[PDB]
Design a protein around this ligand. Structure first.
Ligand SMILES: NC(=O)c1ccc[n+]([C@@H]2O[C@H](COP(=O)([O-])OP(=O)(O)OC[C@H]3O[C@@H](n4cnc5c(N)ncnc54)[C@H](OP(=O)(O)O)[C@@H]3O)[C@@H](O)[C@H]2O)c1
Ligand SMILES: O=C(O)COc1cc(Cl)ccc1C(=O)NCc1ccc(I)cc1F
Length: 316
């Protein structure tokens, strides 16, 4: 299987990338350096992760060392919810560019479909704990994203955590100039996303699977939640292939024509996670993994559920 997938902007995107949410700032520079040294060419970032400066130090060092050329890297970031307004989008993108020490992003995503009140706080709340919306909508935010392409700040634009109706709304936007290249969504054997993936793929939108290992380090994890890495059924498939459970969990979305972005700051795991191009899951393996779906989400948040554009009320 080829290492990159063709986007609807004409550029190629590496199907494996390194995730950076929760990567501590004192560890992520080494994580990204190691990743690039062992072959990663795609890094998934976001302003809200609070570690783009440190990710950028690694990228810049590897470019300066001539370990890789800029054209060989595929750097992704995301517009946070408190920057959905017309007059804030460019500055948000530029802050990310400055922190990453880049003059363009390969892909810039609307991180969530919901706009929040601008200000210092990433999750502005009212006194009862509900997020405070902005009156921005996904269509006007999209027009602002299109401007970034036309200004040379980003090579591609896309969306993240958009449900099928929200994707459809973007595709049906009056005067749409650039289609979204990517929809980045949670996807793993407990949340298989067949409906949303088929819709996006049918429209030429590439899907990126986040939390492919079930995000065991998510800060709201409960001791009782289901665990992909410990699931004996997945362990069995891994054993049959002489691979680790994580390697199976990474290969799974790859064979569905998805991009996948496992996170690690552990050098041995960063390397392990990249060794997924030399085996194949059978169709039966794939269908068996799909059968484990239970519609379980890592990524959901009660404080945001009443926002008009919160994505997870719809079935898909
Ligand atoms: N667009 C969005 O809204 C959104 C939401 C969630 C995630 N994402 C992106 O997707 C990325 C991945 O998702 P995620 O961070 O939620 O979780 P994940 O990649 O599913 O899991 C990360 C966890 O798995 C561990 N791990 C990694 N490789 C392992 C291995 N080979 N064996 C055992 N454990 C392993 C990591 O530990 P160590 O790091 O300690 O090694 C970490 O605790 C994020 O970092 C972010 O870039 C985007
Ligand atoms: O959103 C992400 O990329 C990962 O999740 C988070 C990352 C950070 Cl730095 C802070 C918070 C979250 C988090 O609560 N995500 C869940 C979530 C956020 C926003 C909305 I709108 C809905 C959600 F489910």
């Amino acid at each position: 299987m080829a290492s990159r997938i063709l986007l609807n902007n004409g550029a190629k995107m590496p199907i494996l990338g390194l995730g950076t949410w929760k990567s501590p700032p004192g560890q992520v520079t080494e994580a990204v350096k190691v990743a690039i040294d062992v072959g990663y060419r795609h890094i998934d970032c976001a302003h809200v992760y609070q570690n783009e400066n440190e990710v950028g130090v690694a990228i810049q060092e590897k470019l300066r060392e001539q370990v890789v050329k800029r054209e060989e890297l595929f750097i992704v970031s995301k517009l946070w919810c408190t920057y959905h307004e017309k007059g804030l989008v460019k500055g948000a993108c530029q802050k990310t560019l400055s922190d990453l020490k880049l003059d363009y992003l390969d892909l810039y995503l609307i991180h969530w479909p919901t706009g929040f009140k601008p200000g210092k706080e990433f999750f502005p709340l009212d006194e009862s704990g509900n997020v405070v919306p902005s009156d921005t909508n996904i269509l006007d935010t999209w027009a602002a994203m299109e401007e970034l392409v036309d200004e040379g700040l980003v090579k591609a634009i896309g969306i993240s955590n958009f449900n099928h109706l929200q994707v459809e709304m973007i595709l049906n936007k009056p005067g749409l100039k650039y289609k979204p290249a990517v929809n980045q969504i949670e996807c793993h054997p407990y949340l298989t996303q067949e409906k949303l993936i088929q819709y996006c793929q049918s429209k030429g939108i590439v899907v990126t699977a986040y939390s492919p290992l079930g995000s065991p380090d998510r800060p709201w994890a409960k001791p009782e939640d289901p665990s992909l890495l410990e699931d004996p059924r997945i362990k069995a498939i891994a054993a049959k292939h002489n691979k680790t459970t994580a390697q199976v969990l990474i290969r799974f979305p790859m064979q569905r024509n998805l991009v996948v972005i496992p996170k690690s700051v552990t050098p041995e795991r960063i390397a392990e996670n990249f060794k997924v191009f030399d085996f194949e899951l059978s169709s039966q393996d794939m269908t068996t993994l799909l059968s484990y779906n239970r519609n379980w989400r890592v990524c959901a948040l009660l404080s945001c559920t009443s926002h008009k554009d919160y994505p997870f009320h719809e079935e898909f």
